[PDB]
Each structure stands twice: as C-alpha cells, then as structure tokens.
Design a protein around this nucleic acid. Structure first.
Lengths: 21, 317, 316, 297
DNA sequence: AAAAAAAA
DNA sequence: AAAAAAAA
DNA sequence: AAAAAAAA
C-alpha cells in the first residue's frame, strides 16, 4: 500500500502518515 | 436548455449508442465518454494512421491499427454499452479528418465545418473532464503502481497527450511534467490536481456541483479530491436517513486551486519559502485545518492526517 | 503645467479615445495605456510586420498580423473606451516608423522627428509604469501561473521585452532574469519589486503619492508592493469614516529600493552574508520589523508573516 | 617641500582650472582629479581614438568621441570648477601621445620626455587613489547595483581598466577579478579594500592621516573602510565640541592593509591604535552603510 | 597605509 | 521613489 | 470550480 498524503487545499504534504509525530 | 458542449455530447452519445446509453450511471457515462474520445482521436481500429512524424515502431503500430477491421455494429463496449448500426455514419460525419486544424477550417469559410470543429473540440474537452473524474474515482480504491513518492504523486492523473491538450489545467502525467520543466509562456496552466469536477451524471446535465445534492461518498470525493488527498475532505459528506448508499453534500472545500504560501523579501524583510512550516520550529502538520464552506458558513476542520484511500479502506473493514 | 512626459500621454489618450477616455478610473487608464503601448510598439493589426530576424512561426504570425484588418473607428477597446476617427491620423503621424532609432533621427537634424521620437519614448515609459502598477494590482488577488517558488517569485512582474526596455528598473520577467544572470555593465539597473508607483489616476496628472490622499487598500498595496509581499504593509492604509472601500494613506514604508545586509571581512573580522539571520542562533523571522514613515516620524512595525495575497483572501 | 608626486598634481590642477580649483573641498578635488585622469587617459572629447583593437561598437564610439567637439575654456566640469584657456596647452605639452611606452622614451634618452612620462605616471597614480577614495565615500551612503552578495562585494571598487592599471593594489572590479581568477606572476598585488587613503584635501598636500586631525565621520570612514565594512570602525572618530559634523580621529585600525588566517562570531574584536596604546574594540555586526542609514534619523 | 615592468 | 545609449 | 491559439 501507499501512505502518502499529498498537499491539498492548503494542507502540507506528508511523506508517510505513520512516521509523522 | 443546455450549453453547446453538453448538447453536443448528449447528441453524440445518443447517436452512437442509441437507447443502450444510460444517462444516470457514472460508469456507463465514463465508458461512453472514453469510447467517444477514442473515436474522435482516430485511435480506434480502421481509422487514419498516425505517420506524420512517427517512428518506425509507431508507424508499424498505426499501420496494424488501420489494417485491423473497424468495430462492427452491436459490439459490446464496457459493461452495458452496445454500438448501434448508425455509429459508422456518425464517425464519418462528425469526426474531423485527421490533421484538421481550426485555422484551415476558418480559412475555408464553411460555417458547417467550423461548427463541426467547435463541436469536436467541446466534445474532447468534456470527454477529458470525464476521463479525469473517472481517474480520480478509480484512484479512490485502486492505488496506481506508478505513484511511489510525492514526486510521482505530484503529476496525477497520468493521461495521454490528447487528454493534456484538451484540459491542460486538469490533466497531469508525463506531458504536464514536460511543460512544467520546459519554458513557461503566457498560456501556461498549472496542474490543478484538486479542481472540482461534477460527476458525469451531473456534468452532462450541466447541474454544477453544490450543497444539497444527492451523491455517493466515493463520487463526491472523486469530484473534489483523489485517493491520496487528505481524509478530512470526507467531512464534505453525510449519510442520508436510514444510511443506505447515497447521502447528501453538506459543504465543499475551499482553496481548491488558488494556494500560494510564499512571502518574498521586501522592505528589509527576509523571504519565506512556506508560511505554514515557518512558524517557530514546531512542524506539527496534524494541527493544520481546512476551511469547508457549508450552508451556514465556513468552518475550519482539523486535518485527519491519513490518505483518502486509507480512510476508505479502514471504513470498509 | 504638467511635464512633457505626462502631457504627451494625455494628448495621445485624448486624440485616440475622444471623450470616452475617463481620467478618474484606474482600470480605464490602464486599458488606455495598454492600448497605446501596443499601438506605439507596432503590435496592432494592420501595422508593420516584425520580420527582421523572425523565425518561421514568428514570421507567419507577424504576416498574419499585417494582413489582418486594422481597428476601425467605434471599436470597443476594453470596457469604457471607444476609438475615434482621428485615431488613424494619430497612429500615422505620432507613431515612429518600424525600426526607427533615435540615433538616426538625431543625426538627420530634423526638429520635428526628434520631438516625435522623444514623445514616443516618454509615452512608452509612462505606459510601462502604468502596466507595472496594473500587474501589481492584478496579482493582489490572482497570482501568476509561473510563480511557484521564491526563485520564480523573485522576477515579478513577468512583462514583455518592450516593457523591460522602457523601464528596466521596474519590469522583471524573462529579460530581467537574463540580464541579471549575465554580464552586468556600468549602466545596469536592479529590479525594484517594491518601487513606489503612484496609481495611474495620479501618475497621469503628476501627483506624487504621499500621506493624506484618498485611495483604496488595493490601490495603495499595488502602489507600494504586490501580492506576495508581507502583509504588514497593510498598516500603511487606514479606512475613513464609514469605510466604503475608500480610506487614506497614513504612511509609506522605508527602505523600498536600497536594501543590503552584507558585511565583508575587514581588519581581521569574518564576513557575514546576512546581518539579520546571523545573531546567535535565534532565527525568529516573525520578530522582524519594517520602518513606516508616518506624518509624525518613522515607526517600527512588526511583520505579519503572511503574504498580502493570503491576508486579503483570509480577510475577504 | 612636497614630493614631486603631489607637486605635479598641484601644477596640473592649477594649469587646467586656474583659481576655480579649491584645494580644501574633497568633492572639488575629486572632480578635478577625475577630469585630469580622463584627460591623461585620452578619454575626453576630441582626443585621439583608441582603435588599436577596437570592436565595431567600440570603434564607432571612439570615432564619435574624436569627432565630438572638445571642451572649451569656461566649460563647467562639476559644480565649482571652470576650465581655462591654458588647458589646451597643458594637454598638448604634458599628456603623452596615445600608445606611448616608457621603454621607448627611456631608450630615446630624452630627459624632457622621460620626465614627462614619469610625471604622467605619478599623476595617474594620484588621480586613481583619489578616485578610489571618492568611490568609497560614495558607497558609504549609496551602494552599487552590481553588489548583491559577498562574491560581488569582494571586488569593490568596480573601477575601469585604466584605474586598475594605475593602482592594482587598491583598485578592484572586473580586471581585479580577472587577475585573481588567473595565473599570478611574481609582481602580483592583492586587492586591499581597506588600505588607508587620506582624504584628497590631505593627499594633495602630503599630510599623513593621523590621530588629532580634524575630519568628518564620513571622511574617516571612507579613508579607512567603505560602505559594507563593519560599523565598529566608527569608533575611530570622535565628535568635537558642539559636533558640527567635524570631529577628530582617535585612532586607526591595525591590520588594515593585510590579513591572513591560515556568539564567537559576533564576539570578534578589531585592534585600534590610540595615543595611549593599542586597544581591542568589539565588533558591531552591522555594515557601515546600514549603521549610517539607521543612525541618520 | 617607494623604485621597476604593463583589454569586454 | 533626472539627463545619455538600447530580442526566445 | 467564456472565447481565441495549439506531440515521448
């Protein structure tokens, strides 16, 4: 699977949802 | 009643598919639009070969396509689309000949030919809008293998050159990458990855997507976002009475296309590469919010921090 | 008692637009200036063709332009400008022939032709100043498609080659990038993105923007800055009684043109590439301040951190 | 009993400007020196053309300059300088002919021509020193357009080719960049952007800039530094009774002309020589240009 | 903070 | 926030 | 979230 969350509607892109924190 | 583009698309679909064309199924409309786009780009079998500047392999491919027999009447397309016996007449009449350019048609001065070319261009634009919407819709439950890093995800959707030519501001892929890398003119358009595109059942009817419409979660999300967009966009929906499968639209996201966060150096100040992350050192992206506009007003909703694909997968388990 | 620079522009606008030219609307003046800039650069239909070194595509485009029917009296140019029958005579007599160079005119010694060339050059300068102001004004709400990063935003505005030729110190774009990224002679002018340009309704009458004149927030912001400049500049304006979109200028920022923060190594000291950031390690960019020249005296105002475009969007 | 170096400059200034040349105003002296430099480099209107290897544009410019009418007596060069009728005679008799080389003059053995060439070289050196000082003085309040980064600021002043030829040690710019970015011979001089140059009013009289002489803050700052040098150098000047824009020099920084090193950054100090002795003064961290702008009001 | 040499 | 010169 | 230009 892919955990990317591209930047949209003024939000900041994420390279990996899990690692964020 | 309807603009020129929608009327042209409806007439063409009705002529080609007769009564087999369902006007209220998104998948059927998308399949019909894809078939029409193939027909109007001379990509189907039995149509003019592309040899102008084609390489030997491309020349062989196009010659094989030309030699191949064209589709016969009644041939199944997609799931529930059947070609009528009169599709050949429509293909011969309404499809401009290969290499036709609007300038040459205008120089000819034939009003009928000018209107034919205008209808063809509008049909290409509508079909490519439907193609982009279907790409988003598929991407909600089917991750693309070609998208591995944010650099690859930056160019979604990956559509052919015709799609980019028709809708440069919506279609991405290799050609959008080439255009961005290369020289930028005054006609350059940036890839609006999250521009709002109404569902095909709405696009053909011309009903602009707004608040209160009866739509499904997947189709709305494809309308306003795609698979890897943040999950907070799911807040733009709400299940209807008794759950079911079709809900209602409670709002729409803002800053769909317009979004610049630079602050250039001016009057003795130092430039900033991004207003958001600058802050003071706390790069917590989970604290960001998106402004959803609803009937009552605009509300800031905290970002979920998980992709739309992952949210849909988790809610389906 | 206006200078010849503005007198020429006013005469040209009057001759070409009759009474339809309104000298109180910024949009109308900008449209008239754009039309006159395209008329004095031989860009209108039916004018000479730029085929000195044109490529195949450019040669074809210029030939099509030459063959295309020229504008006729009564044509609508913009929203509130209508060309008069005299416009043909003005274009024939006041627009120098394509390729004319001031050196040859001066050498010939003809007073009339020298005056015509001087008037044409002054008109080009005024029109390009108005064009840059209009670009700033537009960018306050609709950013260019080419502005993605600070490297791209460093060359705003993106105006044509003739625009850069007329006003190299204000115009940016591709030609400013080409000049800066190349050999720089003694007569080299640095792009001043924040140079103060009065609104066209003030520019075409010689009025100099100052404290206490009635303007609009967008007007002042486009005069002293553009969309991506920090939002603290909004403090230069102040709404009047009842607002009504009309306020007053309460100040103007200092250090709009000359800003250098280098310290070369000298006398055993180490060089610094930027004074502000060096400090001790505290890189708080939101604690910076700008100097505003009020009626009383210079005051330091803390920066906001959000571009003018973003701030206007949020406060809309 | 001044050195011949300054005597030649004084004689030339007197012959070319008569009594209109004021030997006490820095701006007037700088303008006179610039005019004399451009006269001795064969750059004035009506002088010989530089067409040895000129390109098309340069050839045309030189031809136009030659054809252009030369300056005449009574012309205003600057703000307070007026040429005299003797300027033509001085130009004809003192300025060496274009392309003249000192080796040929020495070989000829003519004492008068050798003296003329030596005086011309000395005048060029003095005029270029004055020009460098004037460039520093100008940059103290109005920086150059080309100076954007330390890479660009490393080659100030951006003087012309003849300026670099006369004083390679002090002059910078494009030709100094070329010399540094290239092979270096034995007789190679390093650009000293902070070499001490007394103000022209002191230079033309041979006075050595020293502690206890009345000068302006801008005068001292342009003598010992330039616009982008650190502001700590302002400590070398002390206002007198009532200020009045005239003060006194209390010291001159050491290590001015040469240097080689082969919280803490702002804690660096500069050595200043005072009447009592050497002291160390902490740096300010801001350029002289920015400091003067901030203290202007 | 001297003597010699030597333009895009 | 002036005088001179000068297109992908 | 109009029109006219216009293939790896």
């Amino acid at each position: 699977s892919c955990f990317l969350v591209v930047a949209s509607h003024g939000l900041s892109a994420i390279a990996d949802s899990r690692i964020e924190g | 009643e309807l603009p020129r583009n929608l009327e042209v698309f409806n007439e063409a679909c009705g002529h080609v598919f007769g009564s087999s064309f369902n006007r209220e199924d998104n998948s059927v409309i998308s399949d019909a639009a894809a078939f029409l786009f193939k027909m109007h780009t001379h990509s189907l079998d039995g149509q003019e070969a592309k040899v102008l500047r084609a390489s030997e392999k491309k020349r062989e491919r196009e010659n094989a396509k030309k030699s191949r027999k064209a589709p016969e009447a009644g041939m199944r397309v997609g799931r529930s689309l059947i070609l009528t016996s009169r599709w050949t007449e429509y293909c011969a009449t309404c499809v401009p000949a290969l290499g036709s350019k609007m300038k040459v048609i205008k120089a000819s001065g034939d009003a009928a030919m000018i209107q034919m070319m205008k209808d063809h261009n509008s049909l290409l634009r509508v079909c490519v809008r439907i193609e982009v919407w279907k790409a988003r819709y598929v991407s909600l439950v089917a991750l693309d293998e070609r998208i591995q890093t944010l650099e690859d995800a930056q160019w979604f959707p990956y559509l052919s050159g015709d799609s980019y030519r028709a809708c440069p501001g919506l279609v991405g892929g290799y050609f959008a990458k080439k255009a961005a890398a290369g020289e930028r003119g005054k006609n350059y358009k940036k890839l609006n990855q999250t521009a709002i595109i109404p569902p095909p059942r709405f696009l053909i009817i011309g009903h602009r997507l707004q608040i209160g419409d009866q739509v499904t979660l997947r189709e709305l999300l494809a309308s306003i976002a795609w698979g890897l967009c943040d999950g907070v966009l799911a807040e733009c929906w709400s299940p209807s009475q008794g759950d079911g499968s079709i809900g209602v639209v409670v709002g729409l996201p803002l800053q769909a296309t317009g979004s610049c966060f630079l602050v250039v150096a001016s009057h003795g100040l130092s430039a900033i590469a991004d207003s958001r992350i600058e802050g003071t050192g706390n790069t917590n992206l989970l604290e960001e919010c998106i402004a959803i506009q609803k009937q009552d007003g605009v509300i800031k909703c905290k970002r979920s921090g998980k992709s739309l694909y992952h949210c849909l997968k988790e809610t389906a388990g």
